[PDB]
Design an enzyme around this catalytic site. Structure first.
Site, PDB file in Angstrom:
ATOM      1  N   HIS A   1       0.790  -1.235   0.000  1.00 26.63           N
ATOM      2  CA  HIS A   1       0.000   0.000   0.000  1.00 26.63           C
ATOM      3  C   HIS A   1       0.822   1.286   0.000  1.00 26.63           C
ATOM      4  O   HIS A   1       0.242   2.334   0.219  1.00 26.63           O
ATOM      5  CB  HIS A   1      -0.917   0.077   1.234  1.00 26.63           C
ATOM      6  CG  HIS A   1      -1.841  -1.082   1.402  1.00 26.63           C
ATOM      7  ND1 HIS A   1      -3.178  -1.016   1.077  1.00 26.63           N
ATOM      8  CD2 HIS A   1      -1.632  -2.324   1.901  1.00 26.63           C
ATOM      9  CE1 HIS A   1      -3.750  -2.177   1.349  1.00 26.63           C
ATOM     10  NE2 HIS A   1      -2.835  -2.985   1.861  1.00 26.63           N
TER      11      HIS A   1
ATOM     12  N   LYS B   1      -9.163  13.906   4.409  1.00 27.93           N
ATOM     13  CA  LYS B   1      -8.170  12.831   4.396  1.00 27.93           C
ATOM     14  C   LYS B   1      -7.145  13.180   5.485  1.00 27.93           C
ATOM     15  O   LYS B   1      -7.089  14.322   5.952  1.00 27.93           O
ATOM     16  CB  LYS B   1      -7.481  12.695   3.033  1.00 27.93           C
ATOM     17  CG  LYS B   1      -6.859  13.988   2.510  1.00 27.93           C
ATOM     18  CD  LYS B   1      -6.374  13.903   1.058  1.00 27.93           C
ATOM     19  CE  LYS B   1      -7.513  13.705   0.055  1.00 27.93           C
ATOM     20  NZ  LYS B   1      -7.442  12.410  -0.676  1.00 27.93           N
ATOM     21  N   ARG B   2      -6.328  12.213   5.881  1.00 29.14           N
ATOM     22  CA  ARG B   2      -5.285  12.475   6.872  1.00 29.14           C
ATOM     23  C   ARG B   2      -4.338  13.587   6.380  1.00 29.14           C
ATOM     24  O   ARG B   2      -4.109  13.728   5.182  1.00 29.14           O
ATOM     25  CB  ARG B   2      -4.513  11.185   7.211  1.00 29.14           C
ATOM     26  CG  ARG B   2      -5.326  10.142   7.976  1.00 29.14           C
ATOM     27  CD  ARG B   2      -5.692  10.614   9.378  1.00 29.14           C
ATOM     28  NE  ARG B   2      -4.490  10.799  10.205  1.00 29.14           N
ATOM     29  CZ  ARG B   2      -3.970   9.898  11.045  1.00 29.14           C
ATOM     30  NH1 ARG B   2      -4.545   8.706  11.250  1.00 29.14           N
ATOM     31  NH2 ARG B   2      -2.860  10.205  11.718  1.00 29.14           N
TER      32      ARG B   2
ATOM     33  N   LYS C   1      -0.157  14.692   0.324  1.00 30.10           N
ATOM     34  CA  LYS C   1      -1.554  14.991  -0.011  1.00 30.10           C
ATOM     35  C   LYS C   1      -1.802  16.459  -0.395  1.00 30.10           C
ATOM     36  O   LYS C   1      -2.851  16.777  -0.953  1.00 30.10           O
ATOM     37  CB  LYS C   1      -2.485  14.547   1.133  1.00 30.10           C
ATOM     38  CG  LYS C   1      -2.470  13.026   1.328  1.00 30.10           C
ATOM     39  CD  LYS C   1      -2.998  12.605   2.697  1.00 30.10           C
ATOM     40  CE  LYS C   1      -3.160  11.100   2.912  1.00 30.10           C
ATOM     41  NZ  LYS C   1      -4.156  10.503   1.956  1.00 30.10           N
TER      42      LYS C   1
ATOM     43  N   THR D   1      -9.076   5.983  -1.680  1.00 35.30           N
ATOM     44  CA  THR D   1     -10.444   5.452  -1.689  1.00 35.30           C
ATOM     45  C   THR D   1     -11.500   6.526  -1.441  1.00 35.30           C
ATOM     46  O   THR D   1     -12.656   6.386  -1.870  1.00 35.30           O
ATOM     47  CB  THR D   1     -10.621   4.330  -0.639  1.00 35.30           C
ATOM     48  OG1 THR D   1     -10.201   4.802   0.632  1.00 35.30           O
ATOM     49  CG2 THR D   1      -9.814   3.122  -1.016  1.00 35.30           C
TER      50      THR D   1
ATOM     51  N   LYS E   1     -15.503   7.443  -3.079  1.00 33.43           N
ATOM     52  CA  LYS E   1     -16.695   7.766  -2.290  1.00 33.43           C
ATOM     53  C   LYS E   1     -17.382   9.004  -2.833  1.00 33.43           C
ATOM     54  O   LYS E   1     -18.603   9.032  -2.994  1.00 33.43           O
ATOM     55  CB  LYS E   1     -16.342   7.980  -0.818  1.00 33.43           C
ATOM     56  CG  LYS E   1     -15.719   6.743  -0.145  1.00 33.43           C
ATOM     57  CD  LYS E   1     -15.132   7.118   1.208  1.00 33.43           C
ATOM     58  CE  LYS E   1     -14.220   6.028   1.730  1.00 33.43           C
ATOM     59  NZ  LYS E   1     -13.581   6.429   2.956  1.00 33.43           N
TER      60      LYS E   1
HETATM   61  O1  CNK Z   1      -4.906   0.786  -0.042  1.00 26.21           O
HETATM   62  C1  CNK Z   1      -5.579   1.596   0.928  1.00 26.21           C
HETATM   63  C2  CNK Z   1      -4.872   2.912   1.174  1.00 26.21           C
HETATM   64  O2  CNK Z   1      -3.671   2.614   1.914  1.00 26.21           O
HETATM   65  C3  CNK Z   1      -2.961   3.798   2.305  1.00 26.21           C
HETATM   66  C4  CNK Z   1      -1.868   3.412   3.262  1.00 26.21           C
HETATM   67  N1  CNK Z   1      -0.629   3.006   2.939  1.00 26.21           N
HETATM   68  N2  CNK Z   1       0.078   2.715   4.061  1.00 26.21           N
HETATM   69  C5  CNK Z   1      -0.749   2.973   5.065  1.00 26.21           C
HETATM   70  C6  CNK Z   1      -0.470   2.778   6.499  1.00 26.21           C
HETATM   71  C7  CNK Z   1      -1.543   2.626   7.371  1.00 26.21           C
HETATM   72  C8  CNK Z   1      -1.348   2.429   8.749  1.00 26.21           C
HETATM   73  C9  CNK Z   1      -0.096   2.369   9.268  1.00 26.21           C
HETATM   74  C10 CNK Z   1       1.042   2.517   8.441  1.00 26.21           C
HETATM   75  C11 CNK Z   1       2.343   2.465   8.995  1.00 26.21           C
HETATM   76  C12 CNK Z   1       3.440   2.609   8.213  1.00 26.21           C
HETATM   77  C13 CNK Z   1       3.297   2.824   6.834  1.00 26.21           C
HETATM   78  C14 CNK Z   1       2.059   2.867   6.258  1.00 26.21           C
HETATM   79  C15 CNK Z   1       0.876   2.720   7.033  1.00 26.21           C
HETATM   80  N3  CNK Z   1      -1.974   3.392   4.601  1.00 26.21           N
HETATM   81  C16 CNK Z   1      -2.456   4.514   1.050  1.00 26.21           C
HETATM   82  O3  CNK Z   1      -1.729   5.685   1.428  1.00 26.21           O
HETATM   83  C17 CNK Z   1      -3.655   4.889   0.169  1.00 26.21           C
HETATM   84  O4  CNK Z   1      -3.218   5.466  -1.064  1.00 26.21           O
HETATM   85  C18 CNK Z   1      -4.514   3.665  -0.123  1.00 26.21           C
HETATM   86  O5  CNK Z   1      -5.725   4.049  -0.776  1.00 26.21           O
HETATM   87  C1  PLP Z   2     -12.192   6.743   2.915  1.00 23.16           C
HETATM   88  C2  PLP Z   2     -11.633   7.301   4.202  1.00 23.16           C
HETATM   89  C3  PLP Z   2     -10.197   7.657   4.258  1.00 23.16           C
HETATM   90  C4  PLP Z   2      -9.304   7.506   3.039  1.00 23.16           C
HETATM   91  O1  PLP Z   2      -9.428   8.719   2.255  1.00 23.16           O
HETATM   92  P1  PLP Z   2      -8.248   9.096   1.196  1.00 23.16           P
HETATM   93  O2  PLP Z   2      -8.764  10.376   0.615  1.00 23.16           O
HETATM   94  O3  PLP Z   2      -8.220   7.938   0.208  1.00 23.16           O
HETATM   95  O4  PLP Z   2      -7.027   9.243   2.077  1.00 23.16           O
HETATM   96  C5  PLP Z   2      -9.673   8.185   5.435  1.00 23.16           C
HETATM   97  N1  PLP Z   2     -10.422   8.369   6.531  1.00 23.16           N
HETATM   98  C6  PLP Z   2     -11.749   8.091   6.580  1.00 23.16           C
HETATM   99  C7  PLP Z   2     -12.497   8.324   7.845  1.00 23.16           C
HETATM  100  C8  PLP Z   2     -12.443   7.525   5.413  1.00 23.16           C
HETATM  101  O5  PLP Z   2     -13.775   7.216   5.436  1.00 23.16           O
END
Ligand code: CNK
Ligand code: PLP
Ligand code: CNK
Ligand code: IMP
Ligand code: IMP
Ligand code: PLP
Lengths: 810, 810
Positions: free
Chosen positions: A351, A542-543, A548, A650, A654
């Site tokens: 991811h 988004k975060r 971003k 994602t 939405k």
């Molecule tokens: O496929 C679902 C989403 O995963 C996100 C993600 N990619 N890595 C993390 C992530 C989440 C939680 C903890 C982490 C810790 C270290 C690195 C990445 C993460 N989250 C990507 O940034 C998005 O583009 C993608 O739509």
């Molecule tokens: C869908 C969703 C995300 C992911 O949004 P991105 O624009 O793809 O980062 C993050 N947080 C919440 C609460 C969501 O519902």
């Protein structure tokens, strides 16, 4: 009320009413004279839960008898949100419950608002896991979600003086009616210790034991009577733990801390010991559960025919050496047979692409915590590198590039490398991302084993993200093409034949306007803030992270502000600009960005010359339940990451499904979205990936843009001089410094094209009929982005199981 | 089956069966094919709980409407034991449930054994609180038990190599179906801070807040449809607590530790900070609850007409200055009015005389933790000593003796002194104890305010301690005199007219023999130990402490052993000597006593010359559920504390009620028991209190007894030389040293009389008819020792409320 919410038959309504009163009296121990709305919520939740359990027991029974291949989805995050409405929708109970509650003098919408989000994830990755569970149940797969039951989920965000403050999310305070504790299925997990070699192989001894207690939550499919399980582990100390007396009992907390709190960092790797413990804890408990269920149908040749293990990024990567440990050390299989079984069982989804997001654990941590697993990892590495050497003889640099073990001041294990070596399939999450994986970051692995590499473009569940959150839109669609689209989203393509229909145009525009009024009212009630509901709702949620580019949005906002101040008496399309999202607690720059957004609002929103023409709003505490309110209200979806940084996204999907137009870069799934709707129905701007590479080759100089663009220069001077921070003139000097000298995401390079593209958005919004026709073209082509499609592809191409739309009996 | 267990009517049985199946399916989420006995227990518990709640809601409703005076019983301990059987007995459901379970193919006795003891107390004091709650509900008083919900109750005792090992009592592991969390009624408690004086009086500021979350448990009366509440507080951190991020969340444990664990020390004061926090926590939360309920019926003159607060020893003594703090600082009453209200509201029960048991808190602890309460305490002290000075002018030593503040290296607050000053009634727990209070230890207080001092002799509930644990005895009694005795135990006096009835003699002896066989079987099953069930069952069960003189029992056992070895071929009455009880974890001498008991058994039980004539058994993990098994099996009750040390005892009463004869000293309630049965029906021996005083005046010299008693000398030589510890010859040198040089409880001084008295017991046991006639005389006169009698006396003489035996409607 509306068709897509099911029947309110006389007998159903009567039985729900009597069960509601039974739970209020017996389960909650309240009379009507002292019950609060929260009590009424719980009475309803228990009433609805009762309809799940017969199906839940039957479903699990059916799987035991038929013995289908089992899918185990391992994740450290499941961002479920609220459960009550989703359960009603999936069981066709929504109108019956609305009527039953109405007849008891209650408003069901008011009771739905009392439910806490289950916030066991950070953002996109955790929410993807939740959508996937929904799709797996809807497609009749024998699937189990396995994770950790965090006592505290993602923190609640408060803004105090424009700054983010974090508060603990005590989501279990009032109880969780949806889960069932299963203390009878508690399992031991081992940590520390040392390895002993005997005549009879290796033995892991002198370990500390933590118990893993499972809690099961039901996961209902859409109207098919299938209810799958999400099993979440909680950490407990053994009763002889540390056994002066009083202190030994209080020190039990040290073991139970493992499941205390979700690490609140999205897309950044922090190598903390507590995090590594969480990762092993979930893996170790889950694998024992998997193996016992396999043995209760000596021979592990059939293991990959009965089990698939999907790894949600590298966070559960220790499943690979744990499976080897169990097969070699405990079951006494030879190494090569065990490896064959492991590789055929495991699959890995990547991811990210940012180098700082990859998990690279220091060897000294693994040596102390999991000494047997480190041995197995070295052995895996050695055998893997013997294969590379035979395929590419003499290519000594390839050997150090592909090693699982990284050299340096601190030796580290690259967990992505481990996952690739130990899995029969590796996939990215959008076509451009999966290509990037095989061309740049895992290129060496792709050349050795091209057959491993796949794409599975992400999706979202149309149950939560249309039917549940936007019932008005679901209904007008159902009026024209029926209800089948809800579990077959490709049927939305039929809406293209309504693009010139005046009645449908009117209805689509009316639903959006209702959603906007409803959201504007919600803002006034819960947050004392007023907004013009005829303005264009420009939304970026988004975060908060640099990649971003919330800052690029900020630059546009200040540009519009400066333009209005320059020519006050000229018409401009009114906008409400809404930015929301949480920052990771340790990430200074992200916290500064939130402060800048609120500072802009402090100037813009109180300038009498601006009027109601421009408003900047920071949406506090963005989370799944707030997404369900703001997304149906949006006109414009901001998806403006630097090309090559957002693996998929994602949120973008939405918004598309809910009747917003998209402004964005050719990044992640945006590429596929534009391809489905047609590029003419999308507001694409900025550098493509190739353009970013060209810039990096010759070197990004931000000063060149500053020198050539007067409007941009004006903004940088305003930031530096304290225009947006009069009491603290130098408050934003880190932001200015980063933009001018150390900007990895090239904010200035896309500024000019972004501003021009934003003018085209405004021009289209002046013509509501054409805006709405473009909306219909987006909604109509959003079918590809169903998670049902994503899951069907995983099932056929990775797991080797066939999806089913057949009902189990009720 | 038996009459005293109620009706098994066809419709009741049918409804219980259907509700059992409803809870198995819906509440537990199990089918019949995978359910274990534990599941079946929970299904039954939930089925029985449902019958409570209608009565519970109705009872609390009735109290709100009628507004009777409310009784609040504050205690740090409630030793409840198991709830399922007690609830069935009190609701007349026992035969219906037995039949309903029988028809589903289940044995209800087997399911009852699965329930955990709620072990939220140490011994007699905590169990007295439990018996009192039962009696208060049975007598229709609007009474509330208030305490702490410890996560870990009294430790589980294991014996490993003859030594006590402690294990955490994780009693909530599988859930508690009897409690209801009430997070909606959560209240704040304050700690630390400092005091600020303003124009508007004192303000307590800069405090740390801990939340108190209540859990309510129902307390059913005997067949009167009254269900009262026990409210237990649990500690929770606020959500802004400490709010890097991760550590702040993990540090929430520091606040929640307050309710983590019961202090496991019976009759010894340890001044730990965590204990003081527990004491304030329960008091602070409880008083807010009391006051809000009073306000929801501005004037506190009526407070003592609507509220009584009973203090179970000094552990909740901070209720006195807390009530003053609330009335003066928050409600703005003047001091003298507030004091009048406080004194008339509060009453204090004393439970000890050993100087090391009195709570004396260091001033520096109170200064840091509760600075406002320390100020109020000094003010109370000053005003109190002004009264002493006016009553006894010039008596300067009386002033320092009566002060609440003790001088020394460390200044301390004497909490007993605070309780006496701040309460309108002070009582001891047996007539001899209450006399001792006014003659020696609180003599000065008695001379100032003689009207405060009362006696309320302890009791036990005949529901748990006869009907529940000894159904066979309850039935044969009910055959002759009916069922009314169960809630009017004085009616047992009618059994004196059956003392010469051959059929009744036979039946009493038969029940005892059945109880003995049943217990002997239980020993073989759960502990692989064999016992002769025709032997006299000589039982001493109670917490291990020097003053209880388990060592005197040990000396007798070794005397019998040595006598048998001397004349092997002589007849002696066979005995099984059973000693059980937990030692406080830090109390070295008590742990050595347990080791000595098991060491004696290791020699005696394996000597082939002894045969089955003598067995010494250490009963492991003595607790309420084990008392319910062993007490009905006992022939001889050992109650052999040094005269003047056991305030009352309650175990003594349990044995009397269940058909054991008593060997004991004239101590505590033993005096009143002998007075009720007649001294000729009791095995009284040893020094009276007056004899102990005479010995102390001239000085106790243990060597004199050693020199004069050859049999005693032999035992001391065996202990010293390693007869009972061959591998560690000096293992018991601390015990020998203590007995010869530092024995505060004068074990040798009662030895000779004890041994002679034990010979008289044996002689009577040879004549079963006369043994049994003496038993009938004990049971028949046990009526005074009902806790219904005790509670009626508290109600009339202290609380000013009238008991009722009237049914509420069902
Ligand atoms: O496929 C679902 C989403 O995963 C996100 C993600 N990619 N890595 C993390 C992530 C989440 C939680 C903890 C982490 C810790 C270290 C690195 C990445 C993460 N989250 C990507 O940034 C998005 O583009 C993608 O739509
Ligand atoms: C869908 C969703 C995300 C992911 O949004 P991105 O624009 O793809 O980062 C993050 N947080 C919440 C609460 C969501 O519902
Ligand atoms: O009235 C009921 C019982 O209270 C006991 C007791 N007396 N003090 C304690 C006690 C219990 C728990 C903690 C304590 C801490 C310090 C001192 C005493 C205690 N327990 C007495 O020893 C018994 O004689 C009496 O029958
Ligand atoms: O031995 C068995 N007999 C019958 N059913 C079983 C047995 N073991 C498991 N099951 C079924 O599988 C479910 C338990 O799922 P588990 O989580 O795989 O143990 C139950 O609901 C049962 O219906
Ligand atoms: O305002 C009220 N109206 C009606 N009943 C009340 C009210 N307040 C308390 N009660 C009753 O008292 C009980 C609550 O007890 P509490 O623990 O004193 O709050 C409930 O079961 C109600 O029946
Ligand atoms: C009654 C009881 C006690 C008190 O017994 P004494 O002999 O009065 O000390 C202690 N523990 C348990 C478990 C009891 O049931």
């Amino acid at each position: 009320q509306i068709s897509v919410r099911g029947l309110a038959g006389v007998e159903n309504v009567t039985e729900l009413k009597k069960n509601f009163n039974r739970h209020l009296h017996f389960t909650l121990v309240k009379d009507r004279n002292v019950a609060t709305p929260r009590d009424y919520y719980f009475a309803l939740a228990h009433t609805v839960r009762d309809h799940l359990v017969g199906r839940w027991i039957r479903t699990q029974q059916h799987y035991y008898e038929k013995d289908p291949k089992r899918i185990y989805y391992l994740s450290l995050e499941f961002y479920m949100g609220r459960t009550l409405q989703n359960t009603m929708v999936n069981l066709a109970l929504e109108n019956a419950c609305d009527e039953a509650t109405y007849q008891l003098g209650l408003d069901m919408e008011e009771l739905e608002e009392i439910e806490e989000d289950a916030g066991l994830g950070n953002g996109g990755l955790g929410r993807l896991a939740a959508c996937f569970l929904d799709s797996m149940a809807t497609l009749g797969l024998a699937a189990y979600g396995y994770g950790i039951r965090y006592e505290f989920g993602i923190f609640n965000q408060k803004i105090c003086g424009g700054w983010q403050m974090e508060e603990a999310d005590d989501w279990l305070r009032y109880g969780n009616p949806w889960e069932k504790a299963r203390p009878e299925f508690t399992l031991p997990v081992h940590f520390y210790g040392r390895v002993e070699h005997t005549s009879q192989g290796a033995k892991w001894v002198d370990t500390q034991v933590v118990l893993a207690m499972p809690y099961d939550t039901p996961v209902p499919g859409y109207r098919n009577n299938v209810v799958n399980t999400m099993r979440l582990w909680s950490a407990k100390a053994p009763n002889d733990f540390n056994l002066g007396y009083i202190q030994a009992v209080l020190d039990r907390n040290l073991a139970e801390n493992i499941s205390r709190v979700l690490y609140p960092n999205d897309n950044f790797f922090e190598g903390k010991e507590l995090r590594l413990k969480q990762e092993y804890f979930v893996v170790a408990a889950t694998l024992q559960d998997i193996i016992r269920r396999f043995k209760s149908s000596t021979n592990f040749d059939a293991f990959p025919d009965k089990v698939a293990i999907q790894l949600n990024d590298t966070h559960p990567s220790l499943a690979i050496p744990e499976l080897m440990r169990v097969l070699v050390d405990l079951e006494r299989l030879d190494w090569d047979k065990a490896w064959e079984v492991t590789v055929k069982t495991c699959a890995y989804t990547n991811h990210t692409v940012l180098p700082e997001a990859l998990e690279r654990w220091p060897v000294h941590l693994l040596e102390t915590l999991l000494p047997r697993h480190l041995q197995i990892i070295y052995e895996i590495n050695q055998r893997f590198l013997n294969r590379v050497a035979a395929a590419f003889p003499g290519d000594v640099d390839r050997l150090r590039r592909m090693s699982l073990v990284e050299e340096g001041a601190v030796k580290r294990i690259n967990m992505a490398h481990l996952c690739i070596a130990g899995s029969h399939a590796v996939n990215g999450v959008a076509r451009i991302h999966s290509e990037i994986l095989k061309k740049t970051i895992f290129k060496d692995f792709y050349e050795l084993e091209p057959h491993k590499f796949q794409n599975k473009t992400n999706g979202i569940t149309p149950r939560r993200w249309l039917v549940l959150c936007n019932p008005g839109l679901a209904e007008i669609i159902a009026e024209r093409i029926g209800e089948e689209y809800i579990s077959d989203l490709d049927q939305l393509r039929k809406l293209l034949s309504y693009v010139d229909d005046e009645a449908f145009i009117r209805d689509v525009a009316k639903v959006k306007q209702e959603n906007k009024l409803k959201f504007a009212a919600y803002l006034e009630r819960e947050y004392k803030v007023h907004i013009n509901p005829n303005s264009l709702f420009d939304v970026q949620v988004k975060r908060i992270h640099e990649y971003k580019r919330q800052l690029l949005n900020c630059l546009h906002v200040i540009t519009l502000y400066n333009r209005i101040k320059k020519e006050p008496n000229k018409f401009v399309v009114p906008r409400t600009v809404m930015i929301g999202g949480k920052a990771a607690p340790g990430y200074h720059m992200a916290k500064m960005i939130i402060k800048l957004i609120t500072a802009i609002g402090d100037v813009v929103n109180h300038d009498p010359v601006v009027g109601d023409r421009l408003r900047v709003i920071f949406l506090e505490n963005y989370r799944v339940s707030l997404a369900e309110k703001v997304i149906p209200a949006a006109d414009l979806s901001e998806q403006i990451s630097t090309a090559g940084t957002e693996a998929s996204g994602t949120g973008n999907m939405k918004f598309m499904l809910n009747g917003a137009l998209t402004i964005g870069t050719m990044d992640g799934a945006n590429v596929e979205m534009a391809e489905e709707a047609g590029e003419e129905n999308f507001f694409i701007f900025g550098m493509r990936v190739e353009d970013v590479d060209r810039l990096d080759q010759r070197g990004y100089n931000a000063q060149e843009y500053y020198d050539r663009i007067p409007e941009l220069r004006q903004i940088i001077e305003q930031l530096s001089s304290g225009f947006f921070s009069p009491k603290q003139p130098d408050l934003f000097k880190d932001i200015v410094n980063m933009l001018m000298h150390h900007d990895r995401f090239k904010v200035f390079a896309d500024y000019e094209e972004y501003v021009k593209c934003q003018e085209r958005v405004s021009a289209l919004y002046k013509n509501p009929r054409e805006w709405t026709r473009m909306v219909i073209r987006n909604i109509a082509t959003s079918g590809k982005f169903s998670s049902d499609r994503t899951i069907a592809q995983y099932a056929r191409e990775i797991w080797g199981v066939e999806p089913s739309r057949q009902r189990l009996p009720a």
